[PDB]
Amino acid sequence: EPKFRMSLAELLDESRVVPLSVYGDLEVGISGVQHDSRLVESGDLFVCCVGRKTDGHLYLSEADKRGAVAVVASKEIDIEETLGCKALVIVEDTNAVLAVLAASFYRHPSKSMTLIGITGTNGKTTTSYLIKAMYEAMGLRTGMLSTVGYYIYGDNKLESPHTTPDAVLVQKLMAKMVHNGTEALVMEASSHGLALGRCDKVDFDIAVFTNLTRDHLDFHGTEEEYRDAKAKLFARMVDPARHRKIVNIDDPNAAFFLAQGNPDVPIVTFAMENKSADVHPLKFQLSLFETQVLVNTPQGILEISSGLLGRHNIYNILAAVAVGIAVGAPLEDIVKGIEEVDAVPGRCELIDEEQAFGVIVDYAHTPDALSRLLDYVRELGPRRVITVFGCAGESDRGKRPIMAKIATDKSDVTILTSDNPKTEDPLDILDDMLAGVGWSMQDYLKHGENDYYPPLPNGHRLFLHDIRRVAVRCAVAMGEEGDIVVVAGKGHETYQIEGDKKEFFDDREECREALQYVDELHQAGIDTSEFPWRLPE
Amino acid sequence: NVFSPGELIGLLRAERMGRALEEAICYRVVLLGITRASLNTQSFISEASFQETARVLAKAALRGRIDWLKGLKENVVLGGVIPVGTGFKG
Amino acid sequence: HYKTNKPEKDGLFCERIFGSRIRRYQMGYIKLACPVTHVWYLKRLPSYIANLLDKPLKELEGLVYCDFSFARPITKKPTFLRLRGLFEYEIQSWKYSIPLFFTTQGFDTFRNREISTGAGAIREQLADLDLRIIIENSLVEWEELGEEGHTGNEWEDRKVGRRKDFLVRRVELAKHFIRTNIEPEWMVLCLLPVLPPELRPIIQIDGGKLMSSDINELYRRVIYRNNTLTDLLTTSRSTPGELVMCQEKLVQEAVDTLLD
């Protein structure tokens, strides 16, 4: 039961799949037609995939090589040479072929059940799961797809290499879930996924943006391109008083996207400082464990969700409160959503439940995101800001010094490691990060022979180590009570590629074990105040 | 940087270096012995490896000494023609 | 082979790796699980390793023979264990708490940087030796010494002369390695050569007769101890350190006697 209405030629004919040239008919048995060659299987018709990386001819060639029965391309494609069925059809329109790849009944079920798209610059996945939990608490089973895992419908998420899977494969999975095991099939994609065409080829019931800003500026080549694409996709399939435009009023791209489309759709703002949005925290309970706010709005719920971040998590909770109140006016239904938001997900994780020093696992690789997360932690961090991260090999060489500078500018003590060696020589990119503060590895090594370790001119401190595990355990152990340790090297990722081989030894269980054994370390008498641990005798 | 405080250099070489170099070079005539003078030669195969055979090879392998076969017993141990008499060409 | 007079496979006088002048010229090689150190590079009165490591013979003898520990033999990666200990007669640290803290197999990847025992520690120390700053420090120490003018008895100026002679010998030894293509970490034997069979006393084998000499029985002893050591290392890694360090000493003393 992978899909339906895709194993007959009449089903493709009803789907307006006009290729202008076909041989015989689509008699080959195929559960669901997939535009992508990798998503399609042997003996299954594969329509042309429209994309900047892979064109129609390349997609048809890859499908014929993989064994697809039918391959669509602008020119004549010899798909029957290496296929299980001699019948094939070449479609000269790549976009039309990619649209008709999804079956009619397959696209109809996901469009009829429900749909919720969340394409934001920052904090989109934090609100997507909250909206999914709110919809689940409402009484309708649904799934929210993310960049880490593609989940068309249902609680479980299938493994996908790319951030946004194929549109035809996503539609087939959504149809299979809606057939049995799921009541709603919501397709949620980020700005890049929406601009590529993953979530664009799906009727979205509610298309709101968590954070509208310059997204895919280097890829699309023009600002507000992803917002315009999302607005066009929402206007393609829009219903009166059914689409939600909940977005921060401070962002001009959000207002520009809300201006486009059908005006009959409901519009609302989730800004806290704006008086027109009528939403406001009106509470002072920010903490590393839970930050509860008493929202006082006419449409929004009274209680808010406990967020780990000061403003980002609060903004995500405020954006999700609108989607939670749209289904049910009562605030009691948002209790499950608030509990799921406080569950400390992979992204911007909160501290551990055990009584110990705060540990925050974040996903920060780009300089701007790292800087904003560091600023939010400084605003949240009461006493100290301890961070440990590293750079990836064969990456942007100019990114390491600016990252090291932005980290050392606002952190008292920072540890520099090798987050992703990936065949690059160690102690080389580490020296690149050390050169940002003007130090060289030779100077730190010749100082390490002594027991002084002079600090930075601004008064801060900087440490480094080659291996990631020991340094991370030390950073988790070198922390004060009121201080919190931030690990911005990797978040939901669980892969460390040290050279040619990769090891999956990066997770929060190691931090939990370290926080559990720090008691025994302190009982033994070891000093974990600085990098040179004072070992007794 | 030219010579070390503890060295055994030739007399003519020392005199020529004194006439050449202005840096303070101080040397005193040492009267070697029958055994001591043989242990300090330009070859390690025969004229040096006859009495100790333990450290004369250790220090030679540590320094990587290149020995030019300009002696008699060196070529005797090697097996070639001795450069004395009929073997002396030129 | 007993009562067969045939060369046993993978032995001392075996075939295809030792065997008729090709047999007299062919040699063998034995891999050692634990590094060992040359006989005349250490025990002898001229101790080149001690002159290159700026440490008296007592501690190094201890590392090689007894069980002593260095603070950090190899200095090439950032270290966080502040020990500052030249030689520890006994182990008073929390070896069980520190190793079990981080992770299993997480302690092994970094223990060799600080906690190194055996001839491998000496090898790693000789490997990453900056031979261009050693001469600078030795020359500045020679210039500082002998200029203060602190007189005394014969035990004073005699010791001063011995120290400056050791320093000059160290400078002379260090200047050679810079321009001789000979690396200093080759003084330890990570692999042992094998003498050819005909060079060893071997007339013939008839009716299980073995013409093995003293060097042959020494080679048999060292290869027996080496294969037992590698079998003990391959069987279980959680065994007691005392027995494995004793066996490693046993093979080392054996290969030292063989080289002597």
CB within 8 Å: C103 and A467: no
Query: Which residue of C lies nearest to A531 if distances are taken between CA atoms?
Result: C80
Contacts C46 to B, Cβ<8 Å: 55, 58-59
For residue A114, the distance in angstroms to the closest alpha carbon of chain C comes to: 47
Cβ pair A427:C100 closer than 8 A = no
Nearest residue in C to B57, CA atom: C40
When scoring C168, C181, C185 by the number of chain B Cβ atoms within 10 A, the one with the most, hence best to mutate, is C168
Torsion of CA C157, C159, C164, C167, to 10 degrees: -170
**Minimal CA–CA distance to A203: which of A326, A113, A293?**
A113
Considering only CB atoms, which chain C residues are within 8 Å of B59? 46
Backbone dihedral region of A388: left (phi > 0), alpha (psi from -120 to 50 degrees) or beta? beta
- B58/C169 CB distance under 8 A: no
3-state secondary structure at position A391:
strand
Structure tokens at A104: 């009619």
- Output the DSSP codes for A327-381: H-S-GGGGHHHHHHHTT--STT----SSSSSEEEE----SHHHHHHHHHHHHHH-
Encoded tokens for C140: 């500045």
C229: tokens are 């050591």
Taking the C-alpha atoms of residue A83 and residue A60, their distance in angstroms, rounded to an integer, is 12
- Which phi and psi angles does C120 have, rounded to 5°? -65, -35
Of A445, A466, A469, the CB nearest to C106: A469
CA distances from A392 to A420, A466, A535 (A): 4, 13, 33
SS3 for A398? coil
- How far apart are alpha carbons B47 and B53 in whole angstroms? 10
Which residues of chain C are at the B interface, by a Cβ-Cβ cutoff of 8 Å?
Answer: 40-41, 44, 46, 48, 164-165, 168-169, 171-173, 176, 180-182
- The three-class DSSP label of residue A138 is helix
Three-state SS at A495: coil
Cβ–Cβ contacts within 10 Å for residue C63, how many?
23
| Cβ neighbours of B63 in C, within 8 Å | 176, 180
For C102, the closest of A448, A469, A535 (CB atoms) is A469
For chain A, the distance separating the N- and C-terminal CA atoms, rounded to the nearest angstrom, is 68
CA C72 to chain A, closest CA, distance in angstroms equals: 9
| Chain B residue with Cα closest to C169 | B6
Q: With contact defined as beta carbons under 8 Å apart, do A451 and A532 qualify?
A: yes
Half-sphere exposure of A414 toward its Cβ, with a 13 Å CA cutoff? 24
- A520 and C77 within 8 Å at the Cβ level: the answer is no
Residue C208 region, left (φ>0) first, then alpha (ψ -120 to 50), else beta?
left
Which two structure tokens, joined as six digits, stand for A346?
A: 């992979």
| Whole-angstrom distance, CA of residue A210 vs CA of residue A194 | 14
Cβ contact, residue pair B64, C176, below 8 Å: yes
Question: DSSP letters along chain C, please?
Answer: -TTT--PPTTSSS-SSS---HHHHH--EEEEEEEEEE-HHHHSSSS-HHHHHHT--HHHHHHHHHS----S-S--SS---EE---S--SS--S-TTHHHHHH-TTTTHHHHHHH---SHHHHHHHHHT--TTHHHHHHHHHHHHTTSS----SHHHHHHHHHHHHHHHHHHHHHHHHTTSS--GGGSEEEEEEE--TTTS------SS-----HHHHHHHHHHHHHHHHHHHHHH-SSS-HHHHHHHHHHHHHHHHHHH-
> How far apart are the two ends of chain B, measured CA to CA in Å?
39
C176 to B62: CB separation less than 8 angstroms, yes or no:
yes
**C-alpha gyration radius of chain A:** 26
Residue that is written with structure tokens 């929406």 in the block: A194
Dist. CA A129–CA A30, nearest whole Å = 33
The dihedral formed by the CA atoms of C7, C11, C17 and C20, expressed in degrees to the nearest 10: -40
Which tokens belong to A511? 């931090």
- B interface mutation test: which of C182, C187, C189 has the most B CBs within 10 A? C182
Q: What's A79's DSSP letter?
A: G
> Which tokens belong to A129?
């799961």
* A476, A477, A479, A484 alpha-carbon torsion, rounded to 10°: 20
Cα–Cα dist A145/A117, whole Å: 9
Distance CA A34, CA A66 (A): 12
| Burial class (CB within 10 angstroms; exposed 0-12, middle 13-18, buried 19+) of C144 | exposed
- Please report which helix (H) or strand (E) contains residue A502, including its range: strand A501-503
Chain B environment of C44 (Cβ under 8 Å): 54-55, 58
Does residue B63 sit at the C interface (CB-CB below 8 Å)? yes
Give, for B14, the enclosing helix (H) or strand (E): helix B11-20
Count other Cβ atoms within 10 Å, centred on residue B3.
Answer: 13
Burial class of residue C140 (count of CB atoms within 10 Å of its CB; 0-12, 13-18, 19+): exposed
- How far does Cα A510 stand from its chain's mean position? 23
Nearest CB among A427, A470, A532 relative to C106 is that of: A470
Tokens 């020679």 locate to: C142
List the resolution, Å. Answer: 3.0
Which of C82, C106, C109 lies at the smallest CB-CB distance from A451?
A: C82
- For residue B64, the chain C residues in CB contact (below 8 A) are 176, 180-182
Max intra-chain CA distance, chain A: 86
Whether residue C37 contacts residue C122, with contact meaning beta carbons closer than 8 Å, is answered with yes
The percent of chain A in helix, strand and coil, each rounded to the nearest 5, is 35, 10, 55
Query: Rounded to whole angstroms, how far apart are CA atoms A528 and B6?
Result: 50
Question: What is the Cα–Cα distance from B45 to B71, expressed in whole angstroms?
Answer: 10
Verify whether the Cβ–Cβ distance A534 to C92 is below 8 Å: no
What is the phi/psi pair of residue A304, to 5°?
-120, 170
Tokens standing for C51? 């002159």
> Sign of the C-alpha dihedral, residues A66, A71, A75, A77?
positive
Contacts of C164 in chain B (CB under 8 A): 5
**Distance to chain A for C73, nearest Cα, Å:** 11
CA distances from A306 to A146, A361, C107, C141 (A): 21, 17, 38, 65
CA distance A469 to B25: 59
For residue A141 the two structure tokens come to 């089973």
CB contact under 8 A, C41 and B58: yes
| Partner-chain residue, chosen from C81, C98, C103, that has the shortest CB–CB distance to A510 | C103
Instruction: Tell me which residue in C75, C80, C88 faces A449 most closely, judged by beta carbons.
Output: C75
Q: Is A91 exposed, middle or buried (0-12, 13-18, 19+ CB in 10 A)?
A: buried
Residues of A in CB contact (< 8 Å) with C are: 427, 444-445, 448-449, 451, 463-467, 469-470, 473-474, 505, 510, 513-514, 517, 520-521, 524-526, 531-537
| CB contact (8 A) between residue C40 and residue B55 | yes
Encode A415-449 in three state secondary structure.
EEEEEECCCCCCCCHHHHHHHHHCCCHHHHHHHHC
Interface probe for A, chosen from C89, C101, C128 (most Cβ of A below 10 Å), is C101
The answer to whether the beta carbons of residues A126 and A311 sit under 8 Å apart is no
Q: How far apart are CA A199 and CA A170, in angstroms?
A: 9
Search chain B and give the residue with CA nearest C162. B6
